[PDB]
Amino acid sequence: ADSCIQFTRHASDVLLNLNRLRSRDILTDVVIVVSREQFRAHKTVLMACSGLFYSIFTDQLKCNLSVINLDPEINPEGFCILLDFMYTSRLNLREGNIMAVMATAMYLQMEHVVDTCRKFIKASE
Amino acid sequence: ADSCIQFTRHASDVLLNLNRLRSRDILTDVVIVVSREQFRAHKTVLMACSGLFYSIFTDQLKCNLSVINLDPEINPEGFCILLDFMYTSRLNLREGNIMAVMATAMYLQMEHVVDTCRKFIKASE
C-alpha cells in the first residue's frame, strides 16, 4: 500500500543478524573453496551480493551443490575481504591488497566494489 | 581492521535482492501455515527479524522441519503484513489492521513493531 511507514535501521539490523548466524555457523548451506582454503556461507547472501553467485545458484544443476570450487587464480585473502564486505557493508581496502581485491571483485561480478577500487588506484597514479 | 570504508546503501540493496528471491520463489526453504493459509520464506530472514523464529530454527529438532504451523489464534492478514515488513523495512499499518498486527508481532517477538503499534494506538485514545 501507499500508506506504509518505514523503520530506517531495519536493513542494517537484518544484515548484522545474518553475520551473527555466519559467525556461529548457523544454517550455513555451502562451502566455497579457494585454493584449498574453505569458507562457509549462506547461498542467499552470496546471490544478493554477486552476479557470479546469482548465476550459479539459479542454475537447475548447480543450485543443489554443497561445495563450489573457484578458479585457481583467485587469492584466498581477497575472497575473505569480499565475503566480510557482503555480510557487513565494510571493505578493508589497503595498498597491499587492492590489486587482489579488484581482481576478485571482477571475477565475482561485484560492480560497486570494482568501481571504488578503480577510483582508489587512479588517485595513487 | 580499523581502516575499512563503508557503502551506505549496501544493507538496503541486499534486502531488496532477498525480497526479489522470495517473489520468484528462489531457494525458499520453509512453509509457514497460518489457519490453512500458506507462506513460503527463507529461514535465515525469519530468524533475523523475529525472536520466535530465532528460537525455532536454532532448536536441534525443529531446525530440520520444512513446515511450521502457527497458533490458530493468529490472523493470516496480520502475518502477511509482518512478512512483507521483514523483507522491505515497510509496515502497512492501518486503523482496520493495527490490533491484529500488534497481536501477531507480540507472538513473533518483534520488539520494534510492538513499540510503534502501542504508540499509534495511544495517539487515537
Partner: peptide, 5 residues
C-alpha cells in the same frame, strides 16, 4: 526510528 518513506 520510523519515517514516511
Amino acid at each position: 526510528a520510523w519515517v514516511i518513506p
